[PDB]
Amino acid sequence: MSNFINIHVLISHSPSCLNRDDMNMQKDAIFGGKRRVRISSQSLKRAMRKSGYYAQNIGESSLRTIHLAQLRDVLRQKLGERFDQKIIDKTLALLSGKISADAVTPWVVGEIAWFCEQVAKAEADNLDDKKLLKVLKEDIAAIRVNLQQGVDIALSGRMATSGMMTELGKVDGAMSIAHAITTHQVDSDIDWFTAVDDLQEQGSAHLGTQEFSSGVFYRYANINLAQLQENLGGASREQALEIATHVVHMLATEVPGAKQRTYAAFNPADMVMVNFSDMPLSMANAFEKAVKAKDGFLQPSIQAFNQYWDRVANGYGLNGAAAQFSLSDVDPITAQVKQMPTLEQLKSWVRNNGE
Amino acid sequence: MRSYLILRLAGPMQAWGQPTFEGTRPTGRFPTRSGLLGLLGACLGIQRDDTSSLQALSESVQFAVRCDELILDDRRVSVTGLRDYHTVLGAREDYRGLKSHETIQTWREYLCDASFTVALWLTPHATMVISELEKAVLKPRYTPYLGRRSCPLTHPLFLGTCQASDPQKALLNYEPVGGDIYSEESVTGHHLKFTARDEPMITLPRQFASREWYVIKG
Amino acid sequence: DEIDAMALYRAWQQLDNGSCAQIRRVSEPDELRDIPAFYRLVQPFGWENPRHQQALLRMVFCLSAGKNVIRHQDKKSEQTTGISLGRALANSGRINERRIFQLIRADRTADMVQLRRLLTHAEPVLDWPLMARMLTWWGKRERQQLLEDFVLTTNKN
Amino acid sequence: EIDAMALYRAWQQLDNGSCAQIRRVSEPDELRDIPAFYRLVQPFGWENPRHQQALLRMVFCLSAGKNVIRHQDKKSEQTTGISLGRALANSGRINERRIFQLIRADRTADMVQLRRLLTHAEPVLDWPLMARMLTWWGKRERQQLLEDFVLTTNKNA
Amino acid sequence: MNLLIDNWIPVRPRNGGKVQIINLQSLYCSRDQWRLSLPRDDMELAALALLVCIGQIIAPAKDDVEFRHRIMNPLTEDEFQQLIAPWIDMFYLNHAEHPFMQTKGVKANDVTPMEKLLAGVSGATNCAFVNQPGQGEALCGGCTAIALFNQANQAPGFGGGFKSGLRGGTPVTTFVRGIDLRSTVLLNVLTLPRLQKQFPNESHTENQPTWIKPIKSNESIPASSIGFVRGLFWQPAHIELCDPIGIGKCSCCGQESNLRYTGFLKEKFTFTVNGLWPHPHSPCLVTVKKGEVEEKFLAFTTSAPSWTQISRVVVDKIIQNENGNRVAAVVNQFRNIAPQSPLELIMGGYRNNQASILERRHDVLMFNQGWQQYGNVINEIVTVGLGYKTALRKALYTFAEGFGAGVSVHETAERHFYRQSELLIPDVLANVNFSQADEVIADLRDKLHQLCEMLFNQSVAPYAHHPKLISTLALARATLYKHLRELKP
């Protein structure tokens, strides 16, 4: 019954450039005094949210539609202190245009409440409904659209432009994604390219440059189960865990799109670990002391992670179910961490609350 | 004489804000009062409209922040900074409706290699008690982060609990000792102050009022 | 910039009996500089600023008459200041006019000694921050104003 | 005035025999009974009677050992360096009552006790400032020593 | 509402707590010690400036004697009432024919929101995304007057045909700071002789406010012909506040008010002020190119730290032949009046791209006593800093281009440099003893030297594994140690 799901991933990409700045230079950061290459949280999370897998398993979930119909009673009990039921059901009739739920997502309550306020203010001055609809047709279209994307909004949070209006409408995602930094110091490379002119191949060419690098990145993300449930209208823990499994999959497979058509770093992760916890922690300090290559960076990184876990986990209060999948057979993490031969078994273990 | 709660705020990246109404989002060098209140808020699952709970929190708790320097393999690593060219496409053009900009741009500053030890205590007019705060920090309800949500913690938020007369005295029991301390309470030998605009005006959303830290140099 | 009087007052009230005891043994304001407990007492109140030292030395010295010899009382909302030292001394009914006479005519150091004796003897009730300002300047004008307030009070009351 | 760092550097480079011979005194005036002393302090104006008392004190403290008093230059930021009292307090080896009984100790009792404190605490300090303090050494320089001690101890805690 | 009579000034006790709203008489005639309190520093600067102007027209001292005297002692209420008497009918926010800083009878198709007076809340395409909404819903009388003043002074103009203020757009304002708001306001008021030395008031020069004697459309105004009252309260735009709504909460202050404002009207309007009005609140850069001279008021143009502008704000430079610099009149005055006093200087300003605020700045600089006379020292500290900065920038620029690595790192590196410099130079300026300062300055140069080395190596580090780069890296390092050696006296 722990509240937080921690997801750790070590993924190695080949020479590429998955994220750069306004000066077309790879993003970076400094960790432990040494420069790591960075893939911003934003870059990664978009990579996820705009992905096909996300569409299919989040954008098309059965919990995606919120039926205003079933929310009548509860909405009335929650808004009865501020509004008379006349304007409440007027309102719900406008919005919907046409099983009783015992609980409701806060952003729904908040936005609804805004619409009620507008309806009341409209009635107090004999404004008639046709022109009321005219005035706020836009807002209605919007909230209608958000009412059929309840899981997307619950996992990632409101879209950048959403028509949300109130303060409860500021909807945070339940998954937080951390920026990804390399486990090691990077020797950046610099491509010097030209552009042949087929009609005058001669002459002296004008060279351009592009920075690029390969590296072993540590992705971290966590999921707040309680908030996921609360923002799905009181869903069950099992349903939250389903959505969570989709986040594990994505964080292990999706890669930002940048420069991929010319550098093609389409790499799956070589280690994924999931870990239940009361307090979400990043294990990034496994690499505070930058990793030094020894037959590559992947193995020393995995080893550094396993060993850091062995060293601190118990003391840091990471007492909760824990599993690890990896394609690299390095000296294993401790035995309280149950090994998964395949990603899918890891997923289903998450699906089963870690048993 | 007084009982303190001791927290550690540590992660690869942090961000603690300064006055801005622009697309560049600045950081200072240590946690802001507003931000610490926000951290505690997140632990005590307080929704953003809950002005009562927010006010209770703000009036109950006070902080002292120590800036811990990092040491790797017997060498000092100074806190440095970072600017992220942060882009948003499909961003709202207006608060009402659904028209949106192709691309907008923001610049966001972070702290690198930063770590803090915070001591908090209760006020005489406290609506709360420390047991609550401890329970919360150990089992938070909303996701806790260091400034921004992209900034995980690399060490449990709870460090310890103790009892002393100063904040200074309290913090002495917890390594690393030697960093500067910014306290909401005065410490007798020390006279310097540091002005900020941390204090959240709870009655007026997303607006902050000036306050002053007391500085205890190390 | 200006010295907090009320803070110092309350500080003196809540001082541990041993420290108070250590301070109560001076027989002359400058002797306060021989005493650790003193520096610990006045450190928060700007002792380290040379401008405020003489002033502080007097304040503490008078307070050093006893832990509650100087009873502070707030002024009434109506009037602009509270009870002056002279007035309180007169109100006590224990202070003879000639005492004030010889007080305002005394040399430096001696005056403060005498004053402290008068305070122990009277246990005055007065506006302490007012007295504190007075001690802050303590010149001809102030001594004179002391005796005047005494005389006029004793006259009506 | 008397050159301080010169006297210090001379003391650091004195020959160990003279050095041990000087250390052996038990009272500043006994230095007058020693040749090595005169040769040491002559380049620094011992021949001028105004400077004599002072020198006697300075050397006496230095006589604690060739490397008991550790000079450290003031940081360019700070207007003055580390004074004696701060140094002693910083040592963590000195008890407040030693300092208290030091400043209340009579000519002569005084220097002996100070030297004992110096050997015990092996303080790091701005030497020329100490030298000045020793040049004058009157009620207020003593009281200032106690101030720095007490206030530093309170600051640091 | 009337600025001289009614309560508008947002303050909290210097030491104290709960905010209250006083009137000018309570400020000028009370030994109560006040400090401004709004949720924004730019609006506090707007406020302070407004108050200073006000005081500058109602009560300039007749000599330094009186100046010191009134700083040390508040006025009597009667003195005050006598002083403000002839001005009252000029400071009415809502008035029949002369509204404060507004223009009666404005032709506008639609109502402009109140937010457009709040510099920064909107104006750029990323504002709706990063900013909290509703801040311009309904404003106090005070928040409004103050915003109005800020818009006609330090903020950028609305755009198209909305002329900027008299000092140009986005000037830097520098004030002397005191113990309370009272003494502050008084401390930045030019005494009568200095005032008339700077502005000789003729029958030739118009000295009436803009909202009483309007600027004529497309008039060509000789700058010299503007009187200190007309200019200090200059309003270059045609604005007119809509009728106020009822009781409620300043969506800016958080305070409640009897009347609150929800929109205003504006229309385009153009004129031309030939010359430079000698505003007493801002520094003024002078560059003489090709015999011709140009004076221009100081403005934040770059993102570089505030210390890089300190020389332009405290140090005079009057050399005919060359570029020089004039500090703000109030600072020169204070420099004369208080030649034994330290300085606590308030500076602030915006950095903009048309109507877009790109950055806001507000600093309270400190200076030890020697600042009036030892400006050369200050100047040297500042140019030391920039000197080392350019050392680094030139070196890494070399690394990028040649006489090339192919990557530019010098900008990042400058950001690092500047961020550490913020911990170094302002401290120096605040605590150095100008009379004898060579030691501190030399220490600074060593710290900055180390810094440039560290950042140079850090910056080229990731690329130095390829021999072809180590080649040009050697040359770059060479130019670095060049430039770095030329910074040692």
Short mmCIF file of C-alpha atoms in Angstrom, two decimals, chain E residues 23-333:
data_model
loop_
_atom_site.label_atom_id
_atom_site.label_comp_id
_atom_site.label_asym_id
_atom_site.label_seq_id
_atom_site.Cartn_x
_atom_site.Cartn_y
_atom_site.Cartn_z
CA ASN E 23 -2.02 60.27 3.55
CA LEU E 24 0.83 62.58 2.66
CA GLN E 25 0.31 64.77 5.72
CA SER E 26 0.73 61.74 7.95
CA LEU E 27 4.03 61.07 6.25
CA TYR E 28 5.47 64.54 6.22
CA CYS E 29 4.41 65.56 9.72
CA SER E 30 5.01 62.43 11.75
CA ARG E 31 8.05 60.93 13.39
CA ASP E 32 6.49 57.58 12.64
CA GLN E 33 8.97 55.64 10.55
CA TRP E 34 7.47 54.19 7.39
CA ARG E 35 8.50 51.97 4.52
CA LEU E 36 6.61 51.35 1.30
CA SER E 37 4.81 48.05 0.92
CA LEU E 38 3.49 46.68 -2.34
CA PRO E 39 3.88 43.26 -3.85
CA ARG E 40 6.17 44.59 -6.58
CA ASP E 41 9.44 46.49 -6.41
CA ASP E 42 8.93 48.38 -9.64
CA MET E 43 5.70 49.81 -8.27
CA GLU E 44 7.45 50.77 -5.05
CA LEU E 45 9.94 52.61 -7.20
CA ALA E 46 7.07 54.21 -9.08
CA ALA E 47 5.57 55.21 -5.78
CA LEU E 48 8.75 56.58 -4.30
CA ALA E 49 9.36 58.55 -7.46
CA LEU E 50 5.87 60.02 -7.37
CA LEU E 51 6.31 61.10 -3.78
CA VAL E 52 9.69 62.63 -4.57
CA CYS E 53 8.26 64.65 -7.44
CA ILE E 54 5.40 65.85 -5.29
CA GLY E 55 7.76 66.97 -2.56
CA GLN E 56 9.98 68.59 -5.16
CA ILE E 57 7.25 70.94 -6.25
CA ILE E 58 5.62 71.60 -2.90
CA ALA E 59 8.55 71.99 -0.53
CA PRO E 60 12.09 72.53 -1.75
CA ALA E 61 14.41 73.72 1.02
CA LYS E 62 15.76 77.27 0.73
CA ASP E 63 19.23 76.21 1.80
CA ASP E 64 21.22 73.26 3.06
CA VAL E 65 20.59 74.44 6.62
CA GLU E 66 16.84 74.05 6.23
CA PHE E 67 17.42 70.79 4.31
CA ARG E 68 19.25 69.06 7.11
CA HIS E 69 16.85 70.61 9.56
CA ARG E 70 13.70 69.26 7.95
CA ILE E 71 15.21 65.86 7.51
CA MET E 72 15.85 65.80 11.22
CA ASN E 73 12.48 67.27 12.14
CA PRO E 74 9.02 66.71 10.62
CA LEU E 75 6.82 69.65 9.73
CA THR E 76 3.93 70.97 11.71
CA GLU E 77 0.55 70.23 10.16
CA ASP E 78 -0.08 73.91 9.49
CA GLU E 79 3.22 74.37 7.65
CA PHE E 80 2.19 71.42 5.55
CA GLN E 81 -1.29 72.68 4.76
CA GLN E 82 0.21 76.00 3.77
CA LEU E 83 2.71 74.25 1.50
CA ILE E 84 0.21 72.07 -0.29
CA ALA E 85 -2.52 74.69 -0.55
CA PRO E 86 -1.72 76.05 -4.02
CA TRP E 87 -1.37 72.60 -5.58
CA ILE E 88 -4.42 70.70 -4.45
CA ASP E 89 -6.51 71.37 -7.52
CA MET E 90 -3.91 69.68 -9.70
CA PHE E 91 -3.81 66.26 -8.05
CA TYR E 92 -7.34 64.92 -8.46
CA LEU E 93 -7.51 61.45 -9.92
CA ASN E 94 -11.08 61.98 -10.94
CA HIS E 95 -11.73 65.59 -11.79
CA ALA E 96 -14.09 67.47 -14.03
CA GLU E 97 -11.59 69.12 -16.34
CA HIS E 98 -8.10 68.27 -15.09
CA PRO E 99 -7.75 64.58 -14.20
CA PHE E 100 -4.35 63.60 -12.85
CA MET E 101 -2.12 62.47 -15.68
CA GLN E 102 -5.12 61.84 -17.91
CA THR E 103 -6.67 63.61 -20.88
CA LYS E 104 -10.33 64.55 -20.93
CA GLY E 105 -12.32 63.33 -23.89
CA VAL E 106 -10.48 60.41 -25.40
CA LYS E 107 -11.69 58.79 -28.60
CA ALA E 108 -11.25 55.03 -28.43
CA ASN E 109 -13.13 52.17 -30.06
CA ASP E 110 -12.72 49.79 -27.16
CA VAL E 111 -11.67 49.77 -23.52
CA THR E 112 -8.09 48.84 -22.71
CA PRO E 113 -7.78 46.43 -19.75
CA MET E 114 -6.10 47.61 -16.58
CA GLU E 115 -3.36 45.01 -16.98
CA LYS E 116 -1.73 47.02 -19.71
CA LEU E 117 -0.65 49.53 -17.09
CA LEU E 118 0.99 46.78 -15.07
CA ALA E 119 4.38 46.51 -16.74
CA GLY E 120 5.21 42.89 -17.42
CA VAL E 121 2.04 41.00 -16.58
CA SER E 122 1.31 41.03 -20.29
CA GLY E 123 3.00 42.35 -23.38
CA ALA E 124 4.86 39.27 -24.54
CA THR E 125 3.65 36.08 -26.16
CA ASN E 126 4.68 33.98 -23.20
CA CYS E 127 2.83 35.99 -20.59
CA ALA E 128 -0.44 34.14 -20.63
CA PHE E 129 1.51 31.01 -19.98
CA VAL E 130 3.79 31.98 -17.12
CA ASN E 131 1.76 34.60 -15.30
CA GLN E 132 -1.17 34.38 -12.92
CA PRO E 133 -4.38 35.94 -14.27
CA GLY E 134 -6.68 38.56 -12.84
CA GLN E 135 -4.08 41.01 -11.62
CA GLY E 136 -5.65 43.84 -13.57
CA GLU E 137 -9.23 43.19 -12.61
CA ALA E 138 -9.77 46.12 -10.27
CA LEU E 139 -7.17 48.52 -8.91
CA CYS E 140 -7.04 50.83 -5.85
CA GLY E 141 -6.98 54.54 -6.47
CA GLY E 142 -3.39 54.34 -5.34
CA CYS E 143 -2.33 51.29 -7.32
CA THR E 144 -3.80 53.17 -10.30
CA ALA E 145 -2.16 56.54 -9.83
CA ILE E 146 1.10 54.74 -9.22
CA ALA E 147 0.71 52.62 -12.33
CA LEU E 148 -0.15 55.69 -14.37
CA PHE E 149 3.01 57.40 -13.23
CA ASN E 150 5.14 54.36 -13.87
CA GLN E 151 3.80 54.12 -17.40
CA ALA E 152 4.74 57.67 -18.22
CA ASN E 153 8.18 57.28 -16.76
CA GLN E 154 10.07 54.06 -16.43
CA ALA E 155 8.00 51.57 -18.35
CA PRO E 156 8.06 51.09 -22.11
CA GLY E 157 5.27 52.77 -24.04
CA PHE E 158 2.30 50.79 -25.33
CA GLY E 159 3.65 50.70 -28.87
CA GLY E 160 2.51 52.11 -32.21
CA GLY E 161 1.77 55.75 -31.62
CA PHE E 162 2.30 55.96 -27.90
CA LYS E 163 5.20 58.26 -27.20
CA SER E 164 7.57 57.33 -24.40
CA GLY E 165 8.53 59.59 -21.53
CA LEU E 166 10.85 62.56 -21.38
CA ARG E 167 13.95 60.60 -20.44
CA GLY E 168 13.50 58.24 -23.34
CA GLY E 169 12.16 54.75 -22.89
CA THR E 170 13.07 52.60 -19.90
CA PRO E 171 15.41 54.88 -17.96
CA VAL E 172 17.25 53.80 -14.86
CA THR E 173 16.14 55.67 -11.79
CA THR E 174 18.54 56.26 -8.92
CA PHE E 175 17.47 57.64 -5.54
CA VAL E 176 19.23 58.20 -2.24
CA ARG E 177 17.79 56.09 0.58
CA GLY E 178 17.17 57.17 4.16
CA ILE E 179 15.97 55.63 7.41
CA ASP E 180 12.28 55.99 6.72
CA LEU E 181 10.20 56.79 3.66
CA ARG E 182 9.92 60.35 4.93
CA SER E 183 13.60 61.13 5.06
CA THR E 184 14.03 59.29 1.78
CA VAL E 185 11.57 61.43 -0.07
CA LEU E 186 13.12 64.53 1.45
CA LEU E 187 16.62 63.35 0.64
CA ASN E 188 15.89 63.28 -3.04
CA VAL E 189 14.57 66.80 -3.33
CA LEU E 190 16.68 69.52 -4.86
CA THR E 191 17.06 72.61 -2.68
CA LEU E 192 15.71 75.85 -4.12
CA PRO E 193 19.07 77.21 -5.28
CA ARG E 194 20.04 73.92 -6.94
CA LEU E 195 16.57 73.68 -8.38
CA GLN E 196 16.70 77.07 -10.06
CA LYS E 197 20.32 76.58 -11.06
CA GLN E 198 19.08 73.57 -12.99
CA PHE E 199 15.84 75.17 -14.22
CA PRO E 200 15.57 78.96 -14.54
CA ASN E 201 11.81 79.53 -14.70
CA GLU E 202 10.85 82.05 -17.38
CA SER E 203 7.68 83.56 -18.73
CA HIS E 204 9.05 81.77 -21.80
CA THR E 205 8.88 78.34 -20.20
CA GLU E 206 5.56 76.62 -19.56
CA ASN E 207 5.37 75.29 -16.01
CA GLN E 208 1.85 73.88 -16.00
CA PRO E 209 1.05 70.15 -15.87
CA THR E 210 0.27 68.33 -19.06
CA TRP E 211 -3.27 67.67 -17.97
CA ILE E 212 -3.96 71.34 -17.41
CA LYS E 213 -2.21 72.87 -20.42
CA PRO E 214 -2.24 70.07 -23.02
CA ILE E 215 0.54 69.26 -25.42
CA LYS E 216 -0.52 70.35 -28.88
CA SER E 217 -0.62 67.64 -31.52
CA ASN E 218 2.58 67.40 -33.53
CA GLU E 219 3.93 70.39 -31.64
CA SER E 220 7.69 70.78 -31.72
CA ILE E 221 8.73 71.51 -28.14
CA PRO E 222 12.07 73.00 -27.26
CA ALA E 223 13.19 70.86 -24.35
CA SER E 224 14.48 73.99 -22.66
CA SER E 225 10.96 75.43 -22.57
CA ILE E 226 9.59 72.77 -20.23
CA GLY E 227 9.39 73.75 -16.57
CA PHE E 228 10.32 71.46 -13.72
CA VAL E 229 6.71 70.93 -12.71
CA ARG E 230 5.62 70.26 -16.27
CA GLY E 231 8.41 67.79 -16.88
CA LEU E 232 8.55 65.92 -13.59
CA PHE E 233 4.88 65.15 -14.16
CA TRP E 234 5.13 64.80 -17.91
CA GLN E 235 2.54 62.56 -19.53
CA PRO E 236 3.25 61.69 -23.16
CA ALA E 237 0.11 59.69 -23.76
CA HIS E 238 -3.63 60.24 -24.11
CA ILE E 239 -5.12 58.13 -21.30
CA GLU E 240 -8.44 58.49 -19.45
CA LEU E 241 -9.66 56.22 -16.65
CA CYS E 242 -13.09 54.67 -16.99
CA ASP E 243 -15.68 55.24 -14.30
CA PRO E 244 -14.77 53.33 -11.10
CA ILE E 245 -16.66 50.35 -9.76
CA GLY E 246 -17.68 49.82 -6.16
CA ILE E 247 -16.08 48.58 -2.98
CA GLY E 248 -13.83 45.52 -3.16
CA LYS E 249 -10.22 44.34 -3.33
CA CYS E 250 -7.23 45.83 -5.24
CA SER E 251 -6.31 42.84 -7.39
CA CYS E 252 -2.85 44.36 -7.15
CA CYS E 253 -2.50 45.47 -3.51
CA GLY E 254 -4.75 42.89 -1.92
CA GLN E 255 -6.21 45.79 0.01
CA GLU E 256 -9.81 46.90 -0.01
CA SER E 257 -10.88 50.26 -1.41
CA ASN E 258 -13.98 52.37 -1.78
CA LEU E 259 -13.38 52.93 -5.47
CA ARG E 260 -11.59 50.57 -7.85
CA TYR E 261 -10.76 50.97 -11.53
CA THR E 262 -11.33 48.35 -14.21
CA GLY E 263 -10.36 49.90 -17.56
CA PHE E 264 -9.08 53.01 -19.32
CA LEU E 265 -9.11 54.66 -22.73
CA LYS E 266 -6.07 55.45 -24.81
CA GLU E 267 -5.53 56.96 -28.21
CA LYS E 268 -2.44 57.54 -30.32
CA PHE E 269 -0.72 60.91 -30.09
CA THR E 270 2.53 62.30 -31.40
CA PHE E 271 4.76 65.26 -30.76
CA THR E 272 8.48 65.94 -30.64
CA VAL E 273 10.69 67.27 -27.91
CA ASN E 274 13.82 68.70 -29.50
CA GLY E 275 16.57 68.47 -26.95
CA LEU E 276 17.19 66.66 -23.71
CA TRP E 277 15.26 67.65 -20.63
CA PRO E 278 17.60 67.56 -17.62
CA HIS E 279 15.61 65.16 -15.42
CA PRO E 280 17.06 65.02 -11.92
CA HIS E 281 16.42 61.36 -11.22
CA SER E 282 18.57 59.59 -13.79
CA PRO E 283 22.20 59.33 -14.87
CA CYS E 284 23.18 60.52 -18.29
CA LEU E 285 25.80 59.14 -20.66
CA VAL E 286 27.63 61.57 -22.93
CA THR E 287 29.50 60.53 -26.05
CA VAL E 288 31.10 63.01 -28.40
CA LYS E 289 31.36 61.46 -31.85
CA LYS E 290 32.84 63.39 -34.77
CA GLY E 291 32.80 66.67 -32.85
CA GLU E 292 29.05 66.26 -32.35
CA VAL E 293 27.90 65.39 -28.84
CA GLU E 294 25.03 63.17 -27.77
CA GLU E 295 23.60 62.90 -24.30
CA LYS E 296 21.42 59.91 -23.56
CA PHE E 297 19.89 58.68 -20.34
CA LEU E 298 21.14 55.44 -18.91
CA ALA E 299 19.15 52.31 -19.64
CA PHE E 300 19.68 48.62 -19.04
CA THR E 301 20.58 47.23 -22.43
CA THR E 302 22.14 43.91 -21.47
CA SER E 303 21.61 41.16 -18.96
CA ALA E 304 24.91 41.84 -17.27
CA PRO E 305 24.90 42.29 -13.48
CA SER E 306 24.15 45.61 -11.90
CA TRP E 307 27.69 46.23 -10.75
CA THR E 308 28.65 46.68 -14.37
CA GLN E 309 26.63 49.88 -14.31
CA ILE E 310 27.78 51.19 -10.97
CA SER E 311 30.41 53.40 -12.52
CA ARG E 312 27.70 55.12 -14.51
CA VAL E 313 25.62 55.80 -11.46
CA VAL E 314 27.97 57.19 -8.80
CA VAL E 315 30.95 58.47 -10.71
CA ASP E 316 31.09 61.73 -12.63
CA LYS E 317 33.29 62.15 -15.69
CA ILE E 318 33.40 65.55 -17.32
CA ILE E 319 36.17 65.52 -19.97
CA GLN E 320 35.56 67.63 -22.95
CA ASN E 321 37.35 65.70 -25.78
CA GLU E 322 35.96 62.33 -24.84
CA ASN E 323 32.98 60.33 -23.63
CA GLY E 324 31.91 61.25 -20.12
CA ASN E 325 29.11 60.60 -17.67
CA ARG E 326 26.75 62.56 -15.43
CA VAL E 327 25.21 61.05 -12.32
CA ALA E 328 21.67 62.01 -11.36
CA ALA E 329 21.21 65.47 -9.88
CA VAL E 330 19.90 64.16 -6.60
CA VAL E 331 23.07 62.17 -6.10
CA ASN E 332 25.33 65.10 -6.85
CA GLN E 333 23.30 67.15 -4.42
#
